[PDB]
Design an enzyme around this catalytic site. Sequence first.
Site, PDB file in Angstrom:
ATOM      1  N   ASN A 227     -26.934  18.092  -9.245  1.00 16.42           N
ATOM      2  CA  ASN A 227     -28.234  17.443  -9.360  1.00 16.42           C
ATOM      3  C   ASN A 227     -28.283  16.224  -8.443  1.00 16.42           C
ATOM      4  OD1 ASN A 227     -27.690  14.749 -10.831  1.00 16.42           O
ATOM      5  ND2 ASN A 227     -26.574  16.237 -12.086  1.00 16.42           N
TER       6      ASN A 227
ATOM      7  N   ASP B  39     -38.346  19.365  -3.054  1.00 28.62           N
ATOM      8  CA  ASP B  39     -37.616  18.323  -3.762  1.00 28.62           C
ATOM      9  C   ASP B  39     -38.330  17.998  -5.071  1.00 28.62           C
ATOM     10  OD1 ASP B  39     -36.179  16.107  -4.582  1.00 28.62           O
ATOM     11  OD2 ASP B  39     -37.045  14.770  -3.074  1.00 28.62           O
TER      12      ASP B  39
ATOM     13  N   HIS C 208     -35.789  23.846   3.061  1.00 32.17           N
ATOM     14  CA  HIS C 208     -34.949  22.696   3.400  1.00 32.17           C
ATOM     15  C   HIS C 208     -33.448  22.956   3.308  1.00 32.17           C
ATOM     16  CE1 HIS C 208     -34.970  17.975   3.268  1.00 32.17           C
ATOM     17  NE2 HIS C 208     -34.168  18.457   4.200  1.00 32.17           N
TER      18      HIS C 208
ATOM     19  N   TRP D   8     -32.326   6.332   2.461  1.00 37.86           N
ATOM     20  CA  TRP D   8     -31.008   6.890   2.717  1.00 37.86           C
ATOM     21  C   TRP D   8     -30.284   6.140   3.825  1.00 37.86           C
ATOM     22  CZ3 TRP D   8     -35.524   9.309   1.782  1.00 37.86           C
ATOM     23  CH2 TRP D   8     -36.352   9.605   2.881  1.00 37.86           C
TER      24      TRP D   8
ATOM     25  N   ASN E  26     -32.516  18.120  -4.805  1.00 34.66           N
ATOM     26  CA  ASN E  26     -33.380  17.788  -3.681  1.00 34.66           C
ATOM     27  C   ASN E  26     -33.353  18.859  -2.592  1.00 34.66           C
ATOM     28  OD1 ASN E  26     -34.760  16.719  -1.523  1.00 34.66           O
ATOM     29  ND2 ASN E  26     -33.622  14.778  -1.438  1.00 34.66           N
TER      30      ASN E  26
ATOM     31  N   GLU F 110     -45.390  11.565   5.592  1.00 36.54           N
ATOM     32  CA  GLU F 110     -44.613  10.830   4.596  1.00 36.54           C
ATOM     33  C   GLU F 110     -44.112   9.501   5.180  1.00 36.54           C
ATOM     34  OE1 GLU F 110     -41.457  13.162   2.656  1.00 36.54           O
ATOM     35  OE2 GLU F 110     -42.719  14.954   2.816  1.00 36.54           O
ATOM     36  N   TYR F 111     -44.296   8.408   4.439  1.00 29.51           N
ATOM     37  CA  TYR F 111     -43.819   7.097   4.878  1.00 29.51           C
ATOM     38  C   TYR F 111     -43.776   6.134   3.693  1.00 29.51           C
ATOM     39  CZ  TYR F 111     -48.347   4.560   4.751  1.00 29.51           C
ATOM     40  OH  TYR F 111     -49.499   3.931   4.331  1.00 29.51           O
ATOM     41  N   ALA F 112     -43.084   5.012   3.862  1.00 33.40           N
ATOM     42  CA  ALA F 112     -42.980   4.008   2.804  1.00 33.40           C
ATOM     43  C   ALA F 112     -42.428   4.610   1.510  1.00 33.40           C
ATOM     44  CB  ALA F 112     -44.342   3.384   2.550  1.00 33.40           C
ATOM     45  N   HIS F 113     -41.176   5.054   1.566  1.00 35.07           N
ATOM     46  CA  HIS F 113     -40.511   5.654   0.417  1.00 35.07           C
ATOM     47  C   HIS F 113     -40.545   4.628  -0.725  1.00 35.07           C
ATOM     48  CE1 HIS F 113     -37.192   7.738  -1.773  1.00 35.07           C
ATOM     49  NE2 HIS F 113     -37.757   8.788  -1.207  1.00 35.07           N
TER      50      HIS F 113
ATOM     51  N   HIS G  67     -47.238  15.234  -6.119  1.00 36.37           N
ATOM     52  CA  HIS G  67     -46.657  16.430  -6.706  1.00 36.37           C
ATOM     53  C   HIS G  67     -47.396  16.636  -8.023  1.00 36.37           C
ATOM     54  CE1 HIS G  67     -43.157  18.364  -4.943  1.00 36.37           C
ATOM     55  NE2 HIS G  67     -42.699  17.198  -4.522  1.00 36.37           N
TER      56      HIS G  67
ATOM     57  N   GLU H  32     -41.032  25.976   1.751  1.00 41.79           N
ATOM     58  CA  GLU H  32     -40.037  24.966   2.073  1.00 41.79           C
ATOM     59  C   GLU H  32     -38.662  25.598   1.963  1.00 41.79           C
ATOM     60  OE1 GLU H  32     -40.172  20.928   0.507  1.00 41.79           O
ATOM     61  OE2 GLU H  32     -38.040  20.706   0.967  1.00 41.79           O
TER      62      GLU H  32
ATOM     63  N   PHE I 240     -32.990  10.349  -7.684  1.00 42.43           N
ATOM     64  CA  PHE I 240     -33.780  10.538  -6.475  1.00 42.43           C
ATOM     65  C   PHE I 240     -35.132  11.198  -6.747  1.00 42.43           C
ATOM     66  CE2 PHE I 240     -29.364  10.864  -4.406  1.00 42.43           C
ATOM     67  CZ  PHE I 240     -29.310   9.490  -4.205  1.00 42.43           C
TER      68      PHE I 240
ATOM     69  N   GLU J  60     -40.514  20.853   5.551  1.00 45.14           N
ATOM     70  CA  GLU J  60     -39.079  20.920   5.820  1.00 45.14           C
ATOM     71  C   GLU J  60     -38.488  22.330   5.854  1.00 45.14           C
ATOM     72  OE1 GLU J  60     -38.272  17.995   2.555  1.00 45.14           O
ATOM     73  OE2 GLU J  60     -37.714  16.618   4.172  1.00 45.14           O
TER      74      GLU J  60
ATOM     75  N   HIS K 234     -45.805  20.196  -2.248  1.00 42.39           N
ATOM     76  CA  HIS K 234     -45.803  20.843  -0.930  1.00 42.39           C
ATOM     77  C   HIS K 234     -46.165  22.291  -1.261  1.00 42.39           C
ATOM     78  CE1 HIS K 234     -43.729  17.449   0.920  1.00 42.39           C
ATOM     79  NE2 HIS K 234     -42.799  17.514  -0.014  1.00 42.39           N
TER      80      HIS K 234
ATOM     81  N   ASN L  47     -39.598   8.200  -7.103  1.00 40.52           N
ATOM     82  CA  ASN L  47     -39.987   7.324  -6.004  1.00 40.52           C
ATOM     83  C   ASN L  47     -41.506   7.240  -5.889  1.00 40.52           C
ATOM     84  OD1 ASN L  47     -37.894   9.637  -4.978  1.00 40.52           O
ATOM     85  ND2 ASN L  47     -39.965  10.096  -4.265  1.00 40.52           N
TER      86      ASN L  47
HETATM   87 MG   LIG Z   1     -37.243  18.851   1.054  1.00 42.09          MG
HETATM   88 NA    NA Z   2     -36.933  11.342  -3.894  1.00 40.37          NA
END
Ligand SMILES: [Mg+2]
Ligand code: NA
Lengths: 1011, 204
Positions: free
Chosen positions: A585, A189, A406, A987, A90, A525-528, A345, A404, A589, A449, A379, A592
């Site tokens: 790894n 990610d 991150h 998280w 990630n 981004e919202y509502a994972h 993605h 990115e 994750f 990010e 992204h 989703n």
């Molecule tokens: Mg990221």
């Molecule tokens: Na994820």
Amino acid sequence: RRDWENPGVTQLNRLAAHPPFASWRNSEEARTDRPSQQLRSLNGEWRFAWFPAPEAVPESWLECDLPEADTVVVPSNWQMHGYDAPIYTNVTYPITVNPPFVPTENPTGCYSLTFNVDESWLQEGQTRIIFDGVNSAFHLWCNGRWVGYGQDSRLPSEFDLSAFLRAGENRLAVMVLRWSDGSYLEDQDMWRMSGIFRDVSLLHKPTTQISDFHVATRFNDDFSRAVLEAEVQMCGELRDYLRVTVSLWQGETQVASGTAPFGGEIIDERGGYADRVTLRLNVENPKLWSAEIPNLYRAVVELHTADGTLIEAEACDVGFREVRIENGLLLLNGKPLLIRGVNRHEHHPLHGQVMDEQTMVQDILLMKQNNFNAVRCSHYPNHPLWYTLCDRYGLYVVDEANIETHGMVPMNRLTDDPRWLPAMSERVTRMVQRDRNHPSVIIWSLGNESGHGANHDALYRWIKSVDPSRPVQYEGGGADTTATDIICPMYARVDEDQPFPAVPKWSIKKWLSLPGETRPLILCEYAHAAGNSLGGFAKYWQAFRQYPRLQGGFVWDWVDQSLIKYDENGNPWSAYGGDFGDTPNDRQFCMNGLVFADRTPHPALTEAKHQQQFFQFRLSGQTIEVTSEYLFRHSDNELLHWMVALDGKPLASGEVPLDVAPQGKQLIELPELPQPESAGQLWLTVRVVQPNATAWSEAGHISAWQQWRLAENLSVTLPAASHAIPHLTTSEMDFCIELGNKRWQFNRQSGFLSQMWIGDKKQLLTPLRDQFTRAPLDNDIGVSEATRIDPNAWVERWKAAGHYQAEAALLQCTADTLADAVLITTAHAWQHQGKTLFISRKTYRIDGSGQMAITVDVEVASDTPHPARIGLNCQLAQVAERVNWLGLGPQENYPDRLTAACFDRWDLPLSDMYTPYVFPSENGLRCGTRELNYGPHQWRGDFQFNISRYSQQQLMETSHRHLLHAEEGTWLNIDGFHMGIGGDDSWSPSVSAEFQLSAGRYHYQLVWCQK
Amino acid sequence: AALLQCTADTLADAVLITTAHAWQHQGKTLFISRKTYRIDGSGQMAITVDVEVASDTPHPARIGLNCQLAQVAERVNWLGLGPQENYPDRLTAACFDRWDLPLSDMYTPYVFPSENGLRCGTRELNYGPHQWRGDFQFNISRYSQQQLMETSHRHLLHAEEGTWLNIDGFHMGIGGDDSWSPSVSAEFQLSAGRYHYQLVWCQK
Ligand SMILES: [Mg+2]
Ligand code: NA
Ligand SMILES: [Mg+2]
Ligand SMILES: [Mg+2]
Ligand SMILES: [Mg+2]
Ligand SMILES: [Mg+2]
Ligand code: NA
Ligand code: NA
Ligand code: NA
Ligand code: NA
């Protein structure tokens, strides 16, 4: 020179970026977007050889094929062919963080292709090769001679091969490096793969050519008039006889056409651009473009001579629309948008990151059929066909630069470093130069990010300068920096603030009104959607609809990033992080999405569809008020079906045509309804149906629905006095009740109903016992691990409190005989380390009718973490084919995710009562159920339940779904109460207070009998 | 109240009375109340109450029991939110503790008479020889809900014989955002459809 370890060198001999070209040599072909003989595809079978490092590549490979090489299909990611393992991480970079260096052991893929080129392509003009996507860097040779180099895995890299080709056979050699300094800007990610994963083609252009063209559309105040401005640029020899004609078409009708010689207006003291020309076309009453009505025109750009000889033609689809932010609102054609979006993605379970038209079309259809009108290219720039489909099908697009970082510490370490500005600028500028003519793109994003650096402000301004037609957004550094026209936070909650230092996530309602803030807010981004998620989704939409400046968001995310693997027997199964030997790894994750990798919907998708409906409803008496949320279209393909039913039994129905203007309302009075005979609750259900098929849906498609409780008549009639009376038999070990062909066995040592008989057939495999726990959902777990436990995660709080290890201590167990029944009274205490967590007090009343009424009263210590559930469970000895119930359905639904479900009589095969989440967890619950039927059993009351062949224990102990084994019998979980599932993020605890079981004392009652 | 059921059963160490009532109006069943009264050998009376509220009837102001006690005592002792009057949507200032006040203080002298003196989150109530235990809201005074509702001015109220007790398993919010339109927030309206509460009445 190791150009792949130098952010100063992002390319060598690469041609300028530009809009999609095809170099048609026939104008009609350009108008209808037909295949061009000048644009050849080199996709297909190539030769490939894998190497552990570029230093291991033999020099002989440049001149001829390596006998060791295999023949493989291109485009592809070499990990999908099994040459090396795909890696899922990630945030943490897959390589040691030591910019701009990469590991010496750098997986290298050597691609080669022998192909033919006709002399006609070499006798005149320019022949270039186009690599739409190479991950992550590569050197190119043609017939043994070095051509160039290129980086940025998500944009096309083009090279002029005119001086390297010969008539007949030619051989290309491409050395692709898995890691490069470019990898530092590609920490998204997702699975980390590599190779030539997008199309490769050859384009022939005349020497005197169209080298670029920008299309823009300006409008008058009411959009009744527009002007199309087309700036055209050429390369080659300027001649007075050269001309450019731009014509605009609406189907087969030519709307306008303009012609002019080259030579632009004076720009500064040195003059103007002799190699450019701008055409301006007036269009009266233009058909506007929107996601609602994707009206498109076709602009054809012809380069020709005055005598009328065509040199070459280019073209694009044109959507007349204006995007602007005014008085704090993002407007499209003057109307405030409501973004029903999702992050998507580019992922395929079998092909990895290689995209195909079929998969793209499938995603778009599912999106529109589920009421999504927007997508964010998370992204990086997407496969070029994606934009064409969004243009034509109608979806708003956020085009995002492939940047990115991150994994850096702090996140802006590279983005605030001027030495990285060059590399970053190419990722932003080449994206704009490529996609600026697509009407579907309404917003540019600077990446994801990567903190907030000065490089962001510089590029933000560059875009605003070169293309004022679209707003620019970026979430890094707090979601509201000087580098974004839109407050675009990720996972900010509706009412709850998360005051993190430096980069707080304020409640979205609060964010809008912070002192001095005026911008619109749209969550990037919202509502994972990790597994059983989307709890609280309705809360976002209620807010989006009430607050003008809260204009929506993009759900995270569209599809699970699972990959297919095969077991010893050749059977396929969904794999995630770590299943390929990849380490470190981030395991599961990577999953989703709202849909499984094969595009099968997760139950949460329907919740999204319902909340994103374009029609709102209100009921008052016999009048239904329908309000349209559409901004441009009339409801010209919609009719309203209404149905009234008494406890699932239809009593009346009908249909009324919908004729509501955008933003308008329509009143519909229901006919005088006849009063039902029996007692019960009358329910009104309405649904909007589209009679006619569209480009994205079939005839009969349901686009919206809503339910209301109408009149209710409580049952006041008593049941006829039974014939027989239950017989109680007391032993030191059990209390046995007998009535006819039925028998109930209560164990006096455990205090639970240990067995029931119908005839001589046992009905239970496991006693009926209280249950206060659930197999942890992704949201219950968060980022907790055995090696790194997160004491704040719900699962950890339950474990630490002993909820999963608590033992039942029998406090009381007595039997009493009544005039017409037997009453068993029990009381249990669940303790851990001398701590009493829960106390369950029950009474079982078995009467002459054979019905067993169970009354349960539970006490929950106020200082123990609120329990996941409060109910009973047992393993039924039987396995039936169907599951019938009167309650919310038909799909899986939880307390904080049940708005989409409808109350009615549902009947599904047992298998549909189980949701195959790749990572096993509590699933299949159905709420607000008043009656449940399974085999010879019937349960009545007001509960939530799930039923399947998997125990909660197995679901909790199994890592992958393909490892689950159906247990003997059927596990039944009937809950009086169940905790919400949450999902604002995955998280940290995200279950809202109103959905936590904190009452301290709970009561529920069930009646068990034979159907 | 239309009686639907009223039975008596003698258990091993107690007597169990089960009842069921239906409140109707114009042939419409508004509420259904199902109860059980269990009197054991210790003299304690456990009352269990389960109520159904028609979904189409306006949410009720309260769900509880009431009676006029023959006795008049000087003090009211309770373990719950206090010491002052508090309601579901106005009880943040009240604190949980053992409170003890003279009867008169359990009545709030609003010039315009109305429901008043309620105290919520009470686990134990003591009045004279009586003791009620559970998790309820209650008000206790010399004025019936009927008198309060029929009297325009507080000075026109007269103490009735004995003491009126109102014990609710649930009570609606009082609202107040304004006073010319419904203002009780949804979360404080009794709209659950089915309600349950239990009480133990004994002598101390
Ligand atoms: Mg990221
Ligand atoms: Na994820
Ligand atoms: Mg480089
Ligand atoms: Mg040759
Ligand atoms: Mg609804
Ligand atoms: Mg307080
Ligand atoms: Na809004
Ligand atoms: Na219509
Ligand atoms: Na699991
Ligand atoms: Na009054």
